[PDB]
Amino acid sequence: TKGPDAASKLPLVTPHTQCRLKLLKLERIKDYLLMEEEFIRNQEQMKEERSKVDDLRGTPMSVGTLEEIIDDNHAIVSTSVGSEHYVSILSFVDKDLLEPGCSVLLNHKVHAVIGVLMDDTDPLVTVMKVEKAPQETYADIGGLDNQIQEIKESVELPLTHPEYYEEMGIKPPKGVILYGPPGTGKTLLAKAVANQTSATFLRVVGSELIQKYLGDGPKLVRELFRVAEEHAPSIVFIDEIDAIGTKRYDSNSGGEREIQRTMLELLNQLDGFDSRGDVKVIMATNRIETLDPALIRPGRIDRKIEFPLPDEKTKKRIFQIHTSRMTLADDVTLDDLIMAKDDLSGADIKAICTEAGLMALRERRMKVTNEDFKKSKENVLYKTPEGLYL
Amino acid sequence: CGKTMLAKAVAHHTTAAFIRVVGSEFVQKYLGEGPRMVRDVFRLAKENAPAIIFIDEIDAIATKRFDAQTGADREVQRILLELLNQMDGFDQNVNVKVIMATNRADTLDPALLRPGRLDRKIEFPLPDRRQKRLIFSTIT
Amino acid sequence: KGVLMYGPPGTGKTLLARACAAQTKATFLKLAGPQLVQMFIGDGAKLVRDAFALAKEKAPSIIFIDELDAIGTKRGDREVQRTMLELLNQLDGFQPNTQVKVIAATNRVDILDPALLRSGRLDRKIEFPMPNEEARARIMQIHSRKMNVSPDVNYEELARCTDDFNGAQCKAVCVEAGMIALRRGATELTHEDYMEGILEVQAKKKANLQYYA
Amino acid sequence: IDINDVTPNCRVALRNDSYTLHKILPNKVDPLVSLMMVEKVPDSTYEMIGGLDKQIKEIKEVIELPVKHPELFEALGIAQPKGVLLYGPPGTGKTLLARAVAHHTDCTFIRVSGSELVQKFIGEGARMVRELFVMAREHAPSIIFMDEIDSIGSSRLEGGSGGDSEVQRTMLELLNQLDGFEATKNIKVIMATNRIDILDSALLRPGRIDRKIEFPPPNEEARLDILKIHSRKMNLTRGINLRKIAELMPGASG
Amino acid sequence: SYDRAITVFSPDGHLFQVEYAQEAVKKGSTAVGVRGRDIVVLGVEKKSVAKLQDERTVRKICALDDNVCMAFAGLTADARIVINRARVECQSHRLTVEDPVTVEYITRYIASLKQRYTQSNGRRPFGISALIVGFDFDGTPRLYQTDPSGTYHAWKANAIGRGAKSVREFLEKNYTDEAIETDDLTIKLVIKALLEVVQSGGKNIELAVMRRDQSLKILNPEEIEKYVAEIEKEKEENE
Amino acid sequence: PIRALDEGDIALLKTYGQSTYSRQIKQVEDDIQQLLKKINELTGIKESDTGLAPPALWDLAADKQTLQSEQPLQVARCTKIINADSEDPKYIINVKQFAKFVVDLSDQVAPTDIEEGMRVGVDRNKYQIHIPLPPKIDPTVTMMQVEEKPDVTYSDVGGCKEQIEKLREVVETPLLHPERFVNLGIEPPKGVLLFGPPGTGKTLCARAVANRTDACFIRVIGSELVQKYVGEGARMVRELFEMARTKKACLIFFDEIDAIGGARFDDGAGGDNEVQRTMLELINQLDGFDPRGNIKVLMATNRPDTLDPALMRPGRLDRKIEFSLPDLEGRTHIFKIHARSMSVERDIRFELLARLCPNSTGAEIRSVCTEAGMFAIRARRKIATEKDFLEAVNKVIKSRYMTYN
Amino acid sequence: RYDSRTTIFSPEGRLYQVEYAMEAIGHAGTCLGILANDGVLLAAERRNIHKLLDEVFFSEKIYKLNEDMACSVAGITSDANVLTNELRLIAQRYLLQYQEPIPCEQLVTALCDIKQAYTQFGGKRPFGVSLLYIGWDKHYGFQLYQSDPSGNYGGWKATCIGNNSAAAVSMLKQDYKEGEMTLKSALALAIKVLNKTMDVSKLSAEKVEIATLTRENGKTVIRVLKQKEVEQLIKKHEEEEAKAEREKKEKEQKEKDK
Ligand SMILES: Nc1ncnc2c1ncn2[C@@H]1O[C@H](COP(=O)(O)OP(=O)(O)OP(=O)(O)O)[C@@H](O)[C@H]1O
Ligand SMILES: Nc1ncnc2c1ncn2[C@@H]1O[C@H](COP(=O)(O)OP(=O)(O)OP(=O)(O)O)[C@@H](O)[C@H]1O
Ligand SMILES: Nc1ncnc2c1ncn2[C@@H]1O[C@H](COP(=O)(O)OP(=O)(O)OP(=O)(O)O)[C@@H](O)[C@H]1O
Ligand SMILES: Nc1ncnc2c1ncn2[C@@H]1O[C@H](COP(=O)(O)OP(=O)(O)OP(=O)(O)O)[C@@H](O)[C@H]1O
Ligand SMILES: [Mg+2]
Ligand SMILES: [Mg+2]
Ligand SMILES: [Mg+2]
Ligand SMILES: [Mg+2]
């Protein structure tokens, strides 16, 4: 129960326009930051037994794996080179806190237990934590109201109002899979969750839990969920999970068997024998049909959220959101682009806006226009026989 | 019709280096090793300075790219793509020449067959009567 | 000097090895495949050498190597192959006059290295086939010997109904018949309990399908 | 040494017999990736390219304009373009333009090409992609060329006995690096392909590949330009008509 | 794996390829059909045609007999085949019994034909849906709907094709006795229903009307424009 | 026909369409970012808990505990006493990963309590023995065992009556009532494979077994058995079965054993023979040239068709049990179990809901109940009603049958 | 996999084999047709014009179905021959029954119903041939129709099938007068579009065949233009193009002066 790690983020200046009010808000943020900096400086400018204890502690302390603690002052430790020694335990160590497998600390020369180092989290899993917070609030997601509602009910309401569920003896969904075509808000709705959540967010990509050696992928998955459970509440976002989790066929190769083994370790973590803490999982997928049923099972993935290509009103929302910060001209009616019944993702709409801005800049004009938007729409979109029906 | 033999003749009267390989040697089992050996061969030539690579039977790998739909066809196309890359790409080689021998050039990929910085084409037909006279004289 | 017992899983070659070790006297070395792939380089070859040396010291000896396909299949690969080569050398390194016989066992021979099955080395191949109808009737009687099986059971009919059961599957048929008789508070096993035993062994269920007279 | 410069996953030198940290060394980089950045720029120039005026202008927009003048995009209120995909028939100048960009740009030019990210070991292409983009972020602003991306990245196959699941994983990692959490800061990507119809829709999605530049075979005017470009260093006799040669070459690539 | 055979049940009990025929129907343009007191009307989306293309050869509303019409949604060639067979059966029932074909009889025949093609394994189901609107010999505005599976129902108002679900929901909401009290409000209702899917509304609309004892009449484009103008006027007024 | 921006174009577009506050805003934002960096730098780095005890529990002069009792004895296994040569023992030791040695005792007050393979302690410079140690316990396998009983009983497993009865027989009756089996002369099965579609009560039944049993229960982490260092997985399974034999009555619970070993066909799997080797050692332990003792095995798996026939053989997996999709009665019972704790109306037709959910698993039904509660919550209602349950069924089971009227 | 048979529906409702035939029509030699208020006409390219081939038949792609109708075939040769014979049989059966020429739409409908049956029934691959029909009947006068492998047909003022049909139809769309096109202008437009769509050097007259149907003295006449007339049309088109290029050069010179 170390506690939530959160992600420090500065306030948001409501007026996106360049005006004095924005200047005042930013100046207030800056002046508070300056006061904090000077306070730290003044603390350190106005500022024995433990020092000698640390001197007695080895200078280049080594890290070794405790194994089969014995007696009350003698334990067997490992040197991380396979060798193991019947070392002694100084009084400095906590005791009643050493457990087998714990990465204790050893004096370099005499090899005596002198520390416990209960923070031996692998770098591969420490990197995949979220310390910043992307500035994609839910107000940057045009439409997707139902999807936002589902994910809020899954990963936000259980933390902000944990009385509704206890009031009817219901466990909220622990798993969500966001599936859809290539670019519809699947990753925005994880960015927004990270931005607006007080829980430890853990980015991951399915193609990252796979490791070169044997038994390392499952070990990494176990470590990832162990840290996600130590820090609680926590959310684990596995983007593009079809990297690992595809159908479990009868393998003939060895790498494929190892990948499936990693997938089974993930399945056991999601819903295994023992239990699961307050760790909530959000997977993302382009092609859900190819995923294994055991993974899509509605005990590991309680909610499945489709992100279809936006309809007309959602498309209008996307254009509004992505042209808000643009000096749109009064000649532009963002309806001609909406009406055309062509596959337009939110990514396609943003690319359309960017290309319209670039067309204006090419024409030497800083204010976009309708012809610019038409040209951008034509030149951004890259990609049944006639008369066969009707 | 004496094309491997002409390759060996240039190797004999070669002043710098002659790396000989067979196209069927690039189709090994483990993933992404055919391309790795193509890269290794070309890197070896570059490091060994002016050189002549020879690929005896390129029909195995350098065939019309075609639309792959399985890991094996896709890996063969990957071998061909690596070969195209290394023969003419961002890392233009210096004094590294290439010779590729084949039974027919019609099944060859248009990119590798590119009448540019990838190939100049020569035909080794069946011996004419005059050439047969010469073959008999030389052999005897 | 070398006999290989190869067959499908369950035909009874390990039981034959156990029966030999029982009614053979001599000294029996129960080598068991994966035991000889220790991580430390050379440890597997050392184990093979020590086992063969112990067998030699105990003059009349039989070394039963269960599931030889573990020690070396066909080709870490370097170390396992070196252990296989050590076994090959140990086999080749004494005349048949030595009273140290070796009994390998295997489910899948297609895995085994052909070099292992060569003249001088493990040579006397013993195929262990799926039990025929009479063999299945035998196995069932053997494994039902210590029960209250009623005289009316028809082991010939049971053998007819098996249709490509192992000896292990026949034993399981007997065991499941016993459990089914224990259910329904039965003092004796019965032929119908045996039928339910075959059903449970195959994991299938019997239902009164409505489109059958 | 100040602690604050000692960041996780950085190499440091330790004194002998005392293991005292006494220097911060260059960040560790996988040797395959390290020998993948461009040290000696090619000698190709925009003056060696003919008939690709519009393609040069678009590619130059996408790469040059954002890194050099992000203020323009900030004023416009638009997000910078991120990726450009060159495609077209064989030999139309797709790698020539990449070489010209590498020569004429002052940004760190990294280059993958072919199946350099396809490794027999499990989960190695993804790791190599991650290390690549870490290196590009370190030496930002960066331009990552990726020649023949259809090798590493093409329509995904159902996970089975006849599917390259590992190359698919490599491509998925590349997708995540191009556009996932923590969008790239100043990395611009130039992918090059010879057949675009097979690339995964995830790659071709805008935001990952913002712009797509076609390279049609020259239209006899680009052919005259290419003839002049490649005959400049040549002793052409008088009365020689490169226009006539261009006409004689219909549908011929550069 | 329980697919690709027309006669193979899936373990759930589904014959999937007839369902695929229905999914092929869904790829056709909206066709609405309504019945009133003395009028039965069929509307259809035109989808427009290349200016070089001729129009009279693009038919979705076909009169099977004097007192029966059929609107189409699905594969065009299957449309033609089923329409031809339906016409043959109308004029053959006339011979068998000296009475005009009833709408129920002809829709039953079409459904039986589709079922016959779904029964075997060397045939492909007729991937079409049809709206059969007509007047019985006694005089009654009957409307039926037949699916590729060979099942036919009797509806009071229904839409088939691309905008089937939306148009059908709108008809459920806005179909009433006061809305079909006369012979013009029904037409207003059909144009209203189609305007919910067809963007243009005047160049993507064809209406065919059948009145008691009167031959099928296809409304002129100018009349369609006048009607849509009336609906637009009412909409702006009642806003 | 597209000019390129010149020096003046860029120098005017940055200076002509411009807010009089734009420069100040940009500078202030940059200052905020730099200040954030500097603040993080100054207060950066916490105090990673090193394990120090609270003061006054320490004992200085422990520098004397470091100078005396200094010997950081390595652990060695006496593999051969060299026959003891009567006198002059000259023991042998096997310091793992380091070397073999020929050594002697030193101040060993009990030169007789040395034995072979007793895991003695040995000095660094001169390798004389100093003190023996108890046998190794392999902490991974030590924690593999289940200590705290999960809170699942044989009453939350609805729709599985025959399977529960078979599992109870095989796993409990031989343990708590051997009299009937010995009386009938039947040796009960020793080994069960629970298989079925993903989510049917396999692991739930395993949890119920763990709760009910009074005997050693060992949940085997399928990932802990796969490692580098070829032979390590086989060693771990060997030690696991050794500890199981040590325990009077043991119940192993290999979960998702499809991870540890399927078919043995190698071909291109030359790099995946280590997993096959550990699976072969597991097979040998399950049934080989040795009695296995009072060890009963559970093996859960969704896909019991990739498994090795040598492992599925009914000498190792003797009582294969199938968890099929529950029938109507089972589905109704699952609804009742899962809605017992829910705040629902008093007249909901759970038989109707079981009918509405065909070919649905217990996990599916749990999801239906959860979504019914969620729908009630999304309307500020405290009591979930039949309408909410029907909406949940529609949302979960499915996400037109006009030809099947 | 939903394309192993012609009678298999994709889970989306698509007949992949019929779509394959439709796409495969793209291999056929470019045929096109223009309708003029004076008459109707087809043009077609000779894909293979080897010098060792003989010219035994007066037309390779354009067949005369009956007195008042002709058709250009584009697709597999065997299927095209089968369907041409069947079209002639259908027309003559109608003439025997009713004692008047089959209307063009009726003939097209009959053959397209045959094609539909092939797409629908048993183990029979769909006819991999598209057809362009031109004709004159007492009801709608000069008519031009196009028919697909799937048995779908439409009526067109101008259209093109085969190779580069997209470019040819776009060009006709650009440069066709919806109601003020005569036969001479139709022939000129046909030559233009063929020149711009064949994409093989100059428009060799021996590599194109043109047929025109017109009413004369109350009788329909179908004439396959002789090579002399085709050469004259090509020469006139080349002269027109040269004149346009001269005008553009003069404009460029004037711009240079300016
Ligand atoms: N509903 C939306 N509202 C606003 N922006 C959107 C929306 N959908 C997509 N976008 C835009 O799409 C781009 C990124 O999309 P996103 O990362 O959510 O896609 P995705 O579904 O994760 O795609 P992929 O499968 O390729 O990873 C950003 O420009 C984001 O603004
Ligand atoms: N022919 C047989 N006669 C009697 N019992 C048999 C026979 N075959 C198998 N069994 C029974 O099968 C059970 C297991 O047999 P055993 O362990 O010998 O199998 P195996 O096939 O030799 O082994 P492996 O699984 O390594 O292939 C034992 O109960 C044995 O009694
Ligand atoms: N537009 C051009 N202007 C000048 N030279 C050109 C042009 N296009 C191609 N070339 C010449 O052709 C050579 C090959 O072109 P390039 O390597 O860029 O082709 P590519 O598209 O990468 O081909 P590939 O199909 O082999 O992958 C260039 O080095 C240059 O010599
Ligand atoms: N028969 C049942 N009775 C009650 N609850 C059940 C039943 N079957 C499943 N459940 C519910 O489903 C979950 C149990 O799933 P379980 O762990 O047993 O799945 P599994 O079959 O082992 O699946 P997998 O191995 O594929 O992950 C719990 O929510 C439990 O409430
Ligand atoms: Mg995404
Ligand atoms: Mg040769
Ligand atoms: Mg290139
Ligand atoms: Mg489970």
PDB file of C-alpha atoms in Angstrom, chain A residues 10 18 20 22-23 26-27 30 33-34 37 40 53 56-57 67-68 73-74 76 81-82 84-86 89 91-94 100 105 109-111 115-118 149 153 164-165 168 170-171 213-215 218 222 248 252 254 257 261 264-265 268 272-274 294 297-298 303 361-364 366, chain F residues 3-5 9 19 21-22 24-25 28 31-32 35-36 38-39 43 49-53 58-59 65 72-73 75 96 119 124 133-136 139 198-199 203 207 210 219 223 226-228 253 256 258-259 263 265-267 269 272 275-276 302-303 342-343 363-364 370-371 373-374 377-378 380:
ATOM      1  CA  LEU A  10      -0.038  22.242 -13.868  1.00  0.00           C
ATOM      2  CA  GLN A  18      -3.902  35.266 -26.783  1.00  0.00           C
ATOM      3  CA  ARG A  20      -4.372  39.595 -21.139  1.00  0.00           C
ATOM      4  CA  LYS A  22      -4.321  34.269 -20.283  1.00  0.00           C
ATOM      5  CA  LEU A  23      -1.229  36.322 -19.471  1.00  0.00           C
ATOM      6  CA  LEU A  26       0.173  32.125 -16.745  1.00  0.00           C
ATOM      7  CA  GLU A  27       1.905  34.814 -14.686  1.00  0.00           C
ATOM      8  CA  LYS A  30       4.875  31.357 -12.850  1.00  0.00           C
ATOM      9  CA  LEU A  33       6.560  28.429  -9.177  1.00  0.00           C
ATOM     10  CA  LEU A  34       9.085  31.173  -8.402  1.00  0.00           C
ATOM     11  CA  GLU A  37      11.830  27.691  -6.023  1.00  0.00           C
ATOM     12  CA  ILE A  40      13.419  25.433  -1.517  1.00  0.00           C
ATOM     13  CA  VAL A  53      26.306   3.684  11.083  1.00  0.00           C
ATOM     14  CA  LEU A  56      30.201   1.003   9.189  1.00  0.00           C
ATOM     15  CA  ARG A  57      27.859  -0.087   6.396  1.00  0.00           C
ATOM     16  CA  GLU A  67      17.399 -17.278   0.605  1.00  0.00           C
ATOM     17  CA  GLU A  68      16.332 -19.331   3.631  1.00  0.00           C
ATOM     18  CA  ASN A  73      21.200 -13.344  13.121  1.00  0.00           C
ATOM     19  CA  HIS A  74      22.428 -15.628  10.292  1.00  0.00           C
ATOM     20  CA  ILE A  76      21.976 -17.540   3.493  1.00  0.00           C
ATOM     21  CA  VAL A  81      26.697 -14.736  -9.642  1.00  0.00           C
ATOM     22  CA  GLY A  82      25.137 -18.041  -8.593  1.00  0.00           C
ATOM     23  CA  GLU A  84      25.663 -18.206  -2.089  1.00  0.00           C
ATOM     24  CA  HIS A  85      27.069 -17.499   1.359  1.00  0.00           C
ATOM     25  CA  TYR A  86      26.074 -18.170   4.970  1.00  0.00           C
ATOM     26  CA  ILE A  89      22.774 -10.034   9.813  1.00  0.00           C
ATOM     27  CA  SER A  91      21.396  -5.154  14.005  1.00  0.00           C
ATOM     28  CA  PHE A  92      20.901  -2.301  11.519  1.00  0.00           C
ATOM     29  CA  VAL A  93      18.639  -4.467   9.363  1.00  0.00           C
ATOM     30  CA  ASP A  94      14.929  -4.291  10.118  1.00  0.00           C
ATOM     31  CA  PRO A 100      13.025 -15.287   0.782  1.00  0.00           C
ATOM     32  CA  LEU A 105      21.886  -5.643   0.586  1.00  0.00           C
ATOM     33  CA  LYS A 109      33.781  -7.516   1.594  1.00  0.00           C
ATOM     34  CA  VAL A 110      32.512  -9.300   4.711  1.00  0.00           C
ATOM     35  CA  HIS A 111      29.176 -10.055   2.990  1.00  0.00           C
ATOM     36  CA  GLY A 115      19.875  -3.665   3.975  1.00  0.00           C
ATOM     37  CA  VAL A 116      16.779  -4.982   2.260  1.00  0.00           C
ATOM     38  CA  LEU A 117      16.283  -2.720  -0.782  1.00  0.00           C
ATOM     39  CA  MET A 118      12.541  -3.278  -1.110  1.00  0.00           C
ATOM     40  CA  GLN A 149     -19.399   7.115 -20.187  1.00  0.00           C
ATOM     41  CA  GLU A 153     -18.046   3.991 -15.153  1.00  0.00           C
ATOM     42  CA  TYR A 164     -22.930   3.292  -5.683  1.00  0.00           C
ATOM     43  CA  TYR A 165     -21.431  -0.168  -6.155  1.00  0.00           C
ATOM     44  CA  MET A 168     -25.920  -2.866  -4.334  1.00  0.00           C
ATOM     45  CA  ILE A 170     -21.768  -5.071  -7.328  1.00  0.00           C
ATOM     46  CA  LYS A 171     -18.123  -5.219  -8.358  1.00  0.00           C
ATOM     47  CA  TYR A 213      15.113 -15.087 -23.469  1.00  0.00           C
ATOM     48  CA  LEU A 214      13.010 -17.969 -22.166  1.00  0.00           C
ATOM     49  CA  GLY A 215      10.651 -17.280 -19.288  1.00  0.00           C
ATOM     50  CA  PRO A 218       5.995 -14.048 -18.295  1.00  0.00           C
ATOM     51  CA  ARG A 222       4.186 -10.800 -13.433  1.00  0.00           C
ATOM     52  CA  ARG A 248      -3.880 -19.550 -29.354  1.00  0.00           C
ATOM     53  CA  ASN A 252       5.155 -25.724 -34.108  1.00  0.00           C
ATOM     54  CA  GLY A 254       9.482 -22.245 -30.099  1.00  0.00           C
ATOM     55  CA  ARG A 257       5.070 -21.142 -27.822  1.00  0.00           C
ATOM     56  CA  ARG A 261       3.178 -18.565 -22.639  1.00  0.00           C
ATOM     57  CA  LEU A 264      -1.182 -17.188 -20.523  1.00  0.00           C
ATOM     58  CA  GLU A 265       0.789 -15.391 -17.827  1.00  0.00           C
ATOM     59  CA  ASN A 268      -3.521 -15.586 -15.087  1.00  0.00           C
ATOM     60  CA  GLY A 272      -6.129 -16.299 -12.091  1.00  0.00           C
ATOM     61  CA  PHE A 273      -6.348 -18.606  -9.099  1.00  0.00           C
ATOM     62  CA  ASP A 274      -5.579 -16.315  -6.193  1.00  0.00           C
ATOM     63  CA  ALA A 294      -9.814 -16.557 -23.087  1.00  0.00           C
ATOM     64  CA  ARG A 297     -13.469 -13.436 -21.738  1.00  0.00           C
ATOM     65  CA  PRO A 298     -15.990 -11.359 -19.750  1.00  0.00           C
ATOM     66  CA  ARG A 303     -16.494  -4.176 -21.134  1.00  0.00           C
ATOM     67  CA  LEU A 361       0.469  29.147 -45.438  1.00  0.00           C
ATOM     68  CA  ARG A 362       1.534  28.078 -48.935  1.00  0.00           C
ATOM     69  CA  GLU A 363      -0.801  30.702 -50.398  1.00  0.00           C
ATOM     70  CA  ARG A 364       0.869  33.137 -47.938  1.00  0.00           C
ATOM     71  CA  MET A 366      -2.519  32.889 -42.179  1.00  0.00           C
TER      72      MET A 366
ATOM     73  CA  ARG F   3       6.090  30.338 -54.500  1.00  0.00           C
ATOM     74  CA  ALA F   4       8.322  29.405 -51.578  1.00  0.00           C
ATOM     75  CA  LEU F   5       8.273  31.526 -48.437  1.00  0.00           C
ATOM     76  CA  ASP F   9       7.372  36.110 -45.761  1.00  0.00           C
ATOM     77  CA  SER F  19      -1.467  39.425 -30.659  1.00  0.00           C
ATOM     78  CA  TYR F  21       0.525  39.517 -25.864  1.00  0.00           C
ATOM     79  CA  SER F  22       1.830  36.569 -27.903  1.00  0.00           C
ATOM     80  CA  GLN F  24       4.823  37.566 -23.396  1.00  0.00           C
ATOM     81  CA  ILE F  25       2.673  34.427 -23.330  1.00  0.00           C
ATOM     82  CA  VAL F  28       6.004  33.017 -19.628  1.00  0.00           C
ATOM     83  CA  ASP F  31       9.732  30.244 -17.945  1.00  0.00           C
ATOM     84  CA  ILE F  32       7.141  27.969 -16.333  1.00  0.00           C
ATOM     85  CA  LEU F  35      11.032  26.561 -13.393  1.00  0.00           C
ATOM     86  CA  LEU F  36       9.323  23.172 -13.295  1.00  0.00           C
ATOM     87  CA  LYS F  38      14.554  23.415 -11.738  1.00  0.00           C
ATOM     88  CA  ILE F  39      12.091  22.562  -8.960  1.00  0.00           C
ATOM     89  CA  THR F  43      13.760  18.418  -4.469  1.00  0.00           C
ATOM     90  CA  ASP F  49      13.734   2.815   2.004  1.00  0.00           C
ATOM     91  CA  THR F  50      16.865   0.764   2.662  1.00  0.00           C
ATOM     92  CA  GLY F  51      15.475  -1.400   5.477  1.00  0.00           C
ATOM     93  CA  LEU F  52      17.076   0.365   8.443  1.00  0.00           C
ATOM     94  CA  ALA F  53      15.372  -0.392  11.745  1.00  0.00           C
ATOM     95  CA  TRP F  58      20.552  -1.290  16.696  1.00  0.00           C
ATOM     96  CA  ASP F  59      23.604  -2.451  18.628  1.00  0.00           C
ATOM     97  CA  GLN F  65      30.322  -8.971  15.138  1.00  0.00           C
ATOM     98  CA  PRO F  72      31.346 -15.477   5.533  1.00  0.00           C
ATOM     99  CA  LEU F  73      31.025 -19.227   5.159  1.00  0.00           C
ATOM    100  CA  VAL F  75      27.726 -23.360   1.552  1.00  0.00           C
ATOM    101  CA  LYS F  96      28.214 -24.892  -6.557  1.00  0.00           C
ATOM    102  CA  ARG F 119      25.095 -28.743   3.012  1.00  0.00           C
ATOM    103  CA  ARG F 124      36.850 -18.786   1.840  1.00  0.00           C
ATOM    104  CA  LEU F 133      23.137 -26.390   7.499  1.00  0.00           C
ATOM    105  CA  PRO F 134      19.627 -27.761   6.939  1.00  0.00           C
ATOM    106  CA  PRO F 135      18.664 -28.864   3.418  1.00  0.00           C
ATOM    107  CA  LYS F 136      17.807 -26.288   0.778  1.00  0.00           C
ATOM    108  CA  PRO F 139      12.015 -20.375  -1.849  1.00  0.00           C
ATOM    109  CA  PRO F 198     -12.971 -20.127 -21.401  1.00  0.00           C
ATOM    110  CA  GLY F 199     -14.806 -19.384 -18.178  1.00  0.00           C
ATOM    111  CA  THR F 203     -10.422 -22.052 -11.563  1.00  0.00           C
ATOM    112  CA  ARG F 207     -10.488 -22.232  -5.476  1.00  0.00           C
ATOM    113  CA  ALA F 210      -8.347 -25.026  -1.965  1.00  0.00           C
ATOM    114  CA  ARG F 219      -0.782 -23.677  -6.906  1.00  0.00           C
ATOM    115  CA  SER F 223       5.514 -19.050 -15.600  1.00  0.00           C
ATOM    116  CA  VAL F 226       9.963 -21.730 -17.409  1.00  0.00           C
ATOM    117  CA  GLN F 227      13.395 -20.146 -17.061  1.00  0.00           C
ATOM    118  CA  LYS F 228      16.772 -19.720 -18.702  1.00  0.00           C
ATOM    119  CA  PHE F 253      -2.894 -27.495  -9.124  1.00  0.00           C
ATOM    120  CA  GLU F 256      -3.107 -23.233 -17.576  1.00  0.00           C
ATOM    121  CA  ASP F 258      -1.058 -25.441 -21.894  1.00  0.00           C
ATOM    122  CA  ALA F 259       1.852 -23.126 -21.082  1.00  0.00           C
ATOM    123  CA  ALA F 263       2.934 -31.679 -28.411  1.00  0.00           C
ATOM    124  CA  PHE F 265       7.156 -32.208 -32.092  1.00  0.00           C
ATOM    125  CA  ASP F 266      10.266 -30.031 -32.281  1.00  0.00           C
ATOM    126  CA  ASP F 267      11.208 -29.516 -35.949  1.00  0.00           C
ATOM    127  CA  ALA F 269      11.486 -25.672 -32.010  1.00  0.00           C
ATOM    128  CA  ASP F 272      11.984 -24.666 -27.165  1.00  0.00           C
ATOM    129  CA  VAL F 275       9.988 -26.464 -21.910  1.00  0.00           C
ATOM    130  CA  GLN F 276       9.437 -29.905 -23.428  1.00  0.00           C
ATOM    131  CA  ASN F 302      -9.145 -24.240 -21.949  1.00  0.00           C
ATOM    132  CA  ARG F 303      -7.515 -26.094 -24.858  1.00  0.00           C
ATOM    133  CA  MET F 342     -27.311  -7.446  -5.348  1.00  0.00           C
ATOM    134  CA  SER F 343     -30.016  -4.974  -4.348  1.00  0.00           C
ATOM    135  CA  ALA F 363     -18.572 -15.512 -16.318  1.00  0.00           C
ATOM    136  CA  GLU F 364     -20.968 -14.223 -18.976  1.00  0.00           C
ATOM    137  CA  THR F 370     -22.816  -6.520 -13.085  1.00  0.00           C
ATOM    138  CA  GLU F 371     -24.144  -4.637 -16.113  1.00  0.00           C
ATOM    139  CA  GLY F 373     -26.416  -3.111 -11.562  1.00  0.00           C
ATOM    140  CA  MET F 374     -24.471  -0.617 -13.666  1.00  0.00           C
ATOM    141  CA  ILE F 377     -26.621   3.087 -11.175  1.00  0.00           C
ATOM    142  CA  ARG F 378     -26.717   5.068 -14.442  1.00  0.00           C
ATOM    143  CA  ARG F 380     -29.765   7.109  -9.857  1.00  0.00           C
TER     144      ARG F 380
END
